[PDB]
Amino acid sequence: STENRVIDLVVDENVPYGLLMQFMDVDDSVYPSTSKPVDLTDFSLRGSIKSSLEDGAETVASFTTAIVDAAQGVASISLPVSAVTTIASKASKERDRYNPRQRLAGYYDVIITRTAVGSAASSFRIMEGKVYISDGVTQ
Amino acid sequence: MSTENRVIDLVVDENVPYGLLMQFMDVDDSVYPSTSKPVDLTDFSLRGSIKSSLEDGAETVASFTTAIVDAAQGVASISLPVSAVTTIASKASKERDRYNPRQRLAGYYDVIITRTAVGSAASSFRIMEGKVYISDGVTQ
Amino acid sequence: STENRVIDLVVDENVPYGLLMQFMDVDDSVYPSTSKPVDLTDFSLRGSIKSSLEDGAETVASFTTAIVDAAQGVASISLPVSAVTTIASKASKERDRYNPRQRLAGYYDVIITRTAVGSAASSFRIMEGKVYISDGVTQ
Amino acid sequence: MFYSLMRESKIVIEYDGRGYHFDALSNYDASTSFQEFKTLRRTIHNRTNYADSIINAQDPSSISLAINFSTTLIESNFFDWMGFTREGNSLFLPRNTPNIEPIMFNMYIINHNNSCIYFENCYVSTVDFSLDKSIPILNVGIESGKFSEVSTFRDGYTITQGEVLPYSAPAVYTNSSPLPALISASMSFQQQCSWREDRNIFDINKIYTNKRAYVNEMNASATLAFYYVKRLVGDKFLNLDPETRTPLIIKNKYVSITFPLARISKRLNFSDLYQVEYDVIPTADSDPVEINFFGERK
Amino acid sequence: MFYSLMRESKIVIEYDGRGYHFDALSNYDASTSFQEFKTLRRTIHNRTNYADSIINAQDPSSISLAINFSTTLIESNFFDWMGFTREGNSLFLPRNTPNIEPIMFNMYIINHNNSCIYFENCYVSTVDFSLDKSIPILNVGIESGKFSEVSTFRDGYTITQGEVLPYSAPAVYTNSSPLPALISASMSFQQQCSWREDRNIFDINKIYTNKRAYVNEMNASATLAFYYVKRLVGDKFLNLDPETRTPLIIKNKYVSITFPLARISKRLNFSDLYQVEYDVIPTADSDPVEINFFGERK
Amino acid sequence: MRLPDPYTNPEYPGLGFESVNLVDNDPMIRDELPNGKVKEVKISAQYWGINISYPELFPDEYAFLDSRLLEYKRTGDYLDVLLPQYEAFRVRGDTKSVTIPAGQKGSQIILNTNGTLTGQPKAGDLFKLSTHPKVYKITNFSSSGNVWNISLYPDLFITTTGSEKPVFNGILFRTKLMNGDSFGSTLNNNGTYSGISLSLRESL
Amino acid sequence: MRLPDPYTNPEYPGLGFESVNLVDNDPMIRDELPNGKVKEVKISAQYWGINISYPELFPDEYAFLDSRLLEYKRTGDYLDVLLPQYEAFRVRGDTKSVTIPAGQKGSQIILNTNGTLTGQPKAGDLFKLSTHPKVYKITNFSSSGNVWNISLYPDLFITTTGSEKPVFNGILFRTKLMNGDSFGSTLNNNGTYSGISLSLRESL
Amino acid sequence: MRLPDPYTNPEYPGLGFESVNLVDNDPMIRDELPNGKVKEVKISAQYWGINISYPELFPDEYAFLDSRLLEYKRTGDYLDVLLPQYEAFRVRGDTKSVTIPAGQKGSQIILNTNGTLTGQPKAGDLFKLSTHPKVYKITNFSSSGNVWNISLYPDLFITTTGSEKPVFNGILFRTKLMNGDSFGSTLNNNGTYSGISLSLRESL
């Protein structure tokens, strides 16, 4: 995977979450800013959130994945408001003294996969890190 | 900049109706510097609230009376009347800021914009957050 | 320059692993170093993952060598997701200091070989290091 | 009356209309001054003794802050403001300087009783921290153009630094091979800007303050101190020969500065125990230098 | 692995194919370094941030040794190698420098486990010792052109320094009349050579090491510190007037530096107890300066 | 056309005059006789020479200045130069009710202010007529009631027709840019333009 | 032909202007009249002059550069250069469907984009006609919908024939070398060619 | 006769070239018409100018160098100068089985390598014929099978007779020492000679 590229997602309470990626391969040896959007046809990403980083952990939520634009390279990872509410319910209560809005919910990963006839399994991990819930008051 | 960007602090002045003027604008910087256009704010409703603490059981001390002054041009306004300001001032902590004695902590707040429309894009975003402070006054 | 054979592999749990080695032959006689790729003829790579260096150590897994595009020098080393699961089963429960997701699974090394290209078995080790399993959350 | 204590202060940096109150501040130093034009017009008529001095400019201020690492990683904005490009929580050193002028911001130094000193047109010119056997701390150095005294100010109630990160021993690697016997890894990053003085005859009888500046260069550097250790007779890995290109990383549990290709120069000191000292700079064609900021659990 | 301790070392100087192991060494200091050519090619096309640095030369090393006097007088070879002519156990300062280039020799700094640092093309550039109320010791200063790491070396098993000479109080005379109230007699001798850098275009893409040097001048000097003492009112022998030519000798039980004719300049300091300071150099037509080395019983 | 200065355009602070040089150019034929008497002859006219120096210029400041200079060189207009040190407002009022008697061709203006002007001009100030572009310096001034006696350095370049109106404030030099035959500016690798100098000459 | 630069040959970053001096060279019959009036007549054609200074060039980069320059000297054609400070792509679109009505001489020009171009060319930017190789400099801009009115510093060398197409991007100066007669390069002991500079000059 | 360099004589390291200056001397008559068109005329030949600088020289190094220079001035021979930066070996093989068709008098050599040469020459390298001492620089090279198309900066000083053989490696400049009319070197009091410079010119 990308151990050096761990990013912590922040989901707002009482708000549906949305995050969009762009798979866009580059080759700047010919000239700088030579980037071609990767075709995402017949790609299906999927992921999950679990409370602890070990086997036997209780699953918290599964992202409602989608492919917004095929052949344009714009994939999306997201989950509805009810799932965010479940995350907020399951999240820990060890609030920081100087970041009293963020609580830890669990760990997440998502895997992209190729399901092409004439091909084989091409699962690959593209995201890794933790899911932090930001508290909300306006409901 | 995970959350550092959409957080600012508001200081409502006691005995004065507080009104904050917002101007949405779609600024393009990655493609080219110095390019910005207003956001068509039609069907982009706003709503906000204030609470004393972040716990599950918190008191709704006040709530912004948001209004879209201009449908286009991306101009909106969040404001609360004099009664809400008085309620906030009464329901605020008695511990005064040392660097500015007139300011006392009132609570936390959020602002969500709901772009409900005919198109199936009923998304919601939290565009503001922070702490609410009350600035004491004497003119009454 | 000098030697940099020691590189550590971080394989992902529940995801198949595949590494792409672009073999190359750089020479610094001329100031712009020659980009000549080695030509992969009569070459086979062998690699086993074995816990600890002591004699008699059990073979945790074995790398599956792929030789493709011999003209331009590239090659692939891989192992199926079942091999990944077998590796993750025997990994130690202690986690790495810098990343709380990696766990030491064993050691490895791949050995190039020429089989009677000139009636010589010119086999030498290419690379080496430690294999780290990265605990997943998706499954 | 009201005295002003350094311990009773609060430093808030104003950028983009938001206040970045930088708590976990170990110590800061600043000064303000004015520039004078003092000439003595001694003539054969009157060999005078009294000079003709007029204050016409504000000498730029040099503010230095020492900030502890924090769990919310607000301190990475100093790399962000100094010119590094951002992707996630990692800061890249761009191949070319993006803009001619640096990123300008204002800074407040708050104190009790509505007392404040307002530094304006500031830019981050130096950031260096030493990964050592003591708690790491990055000393930032900013230069101001105009300083002023103001009554009301901006105070960062929400944007603040969290708890200081626990100490963790540094370690420097080549690919994945550890380099033995580390002593002190010191990293240095700079944005060597220069003020463009445009004091003209339209500013006569007025106080001039510097306003605009341009970036001469950006760079990333590191000085590594080791003990002279050899494992073999005539060793090839550990010696005193220069290394034109070698992948280096100065890694910690919470930060990792990566040089995809490095130019290393070595220096041996015949001290009580022999010490070798590296001088690591990125090469000509090296990929952008990485600076990762891990809050907790990487 | 193998660490390198200064206390566990042995310094052997290789001259004429024989190893002069200089024991009775109080302390030595040395360093090695490389010269770089680092230019930043910022252009209007690409205002780059990555320099173009290549290591092309070895910076000359500056090794300093502090050596105690010994009964076998091996340390006088430093005067011998620095250019002084020898007759018996006395070293003369020649009227003219004998050769254009200094006397070159190699030096080893041995350590355990076949570890060594090989300084080559060395020359003795400075030798000074202070005859005082502490044990005398002469600090020699040599400059190297090329340093290297070698496996096997030269170790002076036989040629070595004996036991340190016992302390003996210094005394300075004029002919045979003692000079009263001595404080500290410091002697200095130099061979102020200069490296001739001949780095040319045939050395491009290679590491250059200095190889040849020429002697700018040799000299013998001494600074004498006394207490301001007068025996008569309007004394003629002891005063502050300069002395164009006067025979001087700074004598000890084991060494005696002789100036057949000296140029003395005096300097009075109004300190707690008045101190006069001499500046002794040989005159234009003075006979060669003597340096006698008495082991035992003169 | 006005040369850009930080009065009209303060957003470009680099366009200020780092140092001006008001050169007095009055060519004369000077001959020194052996009897110690130096004799001068004046035929040609006197023209004020202005030299402007600039600091390092950012791309936008240089873009504005170069656009203005190229507009000048395109339309063949006359650059107007304003010197701040000569903008002290002493004489205030209306200059339309003041009358200048005609036939004055010497080096002295006698004008009846008609009591419509407050204050008095100071020696060494800048003075100009409303019908001619030449700029004069007041060398002496004596006021006897409402009639003023202003003395000017350059001999009157025009004979007063009686319709001229004195101008004391807001005086500009109708200059023409010299050294424009080979005009350039080097752009350094740091993005700033350097080596910009304007040698202007009063082309009345 | 094209002068090598990091845009054409990115593998040689040593190429590229350390400093470029874009001088204006308009010869003129200037005459200083005795009355103070300065009269100048433009007869000789104007030509931009480009002075390029190179940073430390390594042996391979200088080999490429002087190979290209010697090919220039051999085949005798013109040497095109692309100034990068004027490469701000401020006008998108394809200019083939842009018509310039025929019969236009002088600084002013009128062109109809027919609703094709996106972006406004601000003053100070470059401009060049498709047919003629002369390079102008926009001094003022004014548009009324699709029609654009552009004022250029040098007068249009040739009258528009109704087919010339605007070129707002990738403008190359058709220049000739002026240092060819005695052009030497010094090699240091460090291994770099130092002080390489060119004095170009636009031809026609 | 070869000029002493640290290839043949490494025992004298002071004889290395501290800095070389390959000067391109191609005198031309350049005339600039008022219509902006610059025109050139070439009659005389192009000769490579080489300038050598030296560091401080010890007595033995100076003795060797001076003996060689005096031998040159005695026999009236031609100094051969070798530039290390032009000694990259690309083309290897035999140059005797390669054929050059005759009648080639332009600025381009077409030769059939007959498959006897490995590698290809690079642009900007040094090329020379075996029957003439003039040194050429390859400005362009296109290979279509075995026939090579080498383009040279100086126009061919000879017309190929069909017997010439290309020389790619081991090329020396048949120079003649200029400034030999007043040639000297000051000896300092420290024994080293200083102020030695060789201004050489390619006397083909």
Residue numbers in the entry:
A (entry chain R), C (entry chain S): 2 to 140
B (entry chain Q): 1 to 140
D (entry chain I), E (entry chain G): 1 to 298
F (entry chain Y), G (entry chain Z), H (entry chain a): 1 to 204
Q: Which of the paper's sentences describe this entry?
A:
These structures bring out the important conformational changes undergone by T5 tail tip upon infection, which include bending of T5 central fiber on the side of the tail tip, tail anchoring to the membrane, tail tube opening, and formation of a transmembrane channel.
When comparing the structures of the tip before and after interaction with FhuA, we could observe that they share a common core from the tail tube down to BHPpb3 and only start to diverge from BHPpb3 distal part. The tube extends through the tip: After the last TTPpb6 ring, it continues with a pseudo-hexameric p140 ring, a hexameric DTPpb9 ring, the proximal domains of the BHPpb3 trimer forming the last pseudo-hexameric ring of the tube. The dodecameric p132 ring completely surrounds the trimeric p140 ring, with p132-p132 and p132-p140 contacts in both p132 and p140 proximal regions and, to a much lesser extent, p132-TTPpb6 contacts, mainly mediated through the loops and termini of the three proteins. There is a symmetry mismatch between LTFpb1 3-fold, p140/TTPpb6 pseudo–6-fold, and p132 pseudo–12-fold symmetries. This symmetry mismatch is absorbed by the loops and N termini of p132 monomers.
